[PDB]
Amino acid sequence: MIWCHQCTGFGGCSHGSRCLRDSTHCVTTATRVLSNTEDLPLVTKMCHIGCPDIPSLGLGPYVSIACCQTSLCNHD
């Protein structure tokens, strides 16, 4: 278990939060949303025991997933 960013997005905000006792990795999903009118791309960050995939967060494709085995490895 480690600390990472669990922010919603709206450009790629930040928020150091404690991950799950089981989750020892961080995930970064940078993609658009279902909204037909947006000013910036959505960036949902979270933690997991590896590097899963959930393109359902948007329209499916055009989805990018960047995971890593490092605390708060979602920085810039």
Side-chain angles (χ1 to χ4, degrees), residues 45-69:
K45 297 169 209 296
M46 80 211 64
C47 319
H48 210 77
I49 319 180
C51 183
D53 324 276
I54 309 177
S56 74
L57 270 91
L59 40 68
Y62 290 127
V63 69
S64 210
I65 301 157
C67 317
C68 29
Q69 62 270 339

Side-chain angles (χ1 to χ4, degrees), residues 21-32:
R21 172 166 90 271
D22 209 0
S23 73
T24 321
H25 315 76
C26 326
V27 178
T28 303
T29 65
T31 189
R32 279 270 153 158

Side-chain angles (χ1 to χ4, degrees), residues 10-11 31-42 59:
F10 307 118
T31 189
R32 279 270 153 158
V33 284
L34 91 163
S35 211
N36 309 92
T37 32
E38 324 91 88
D39 59 301
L40 39 76
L42 211 293
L59 40 68

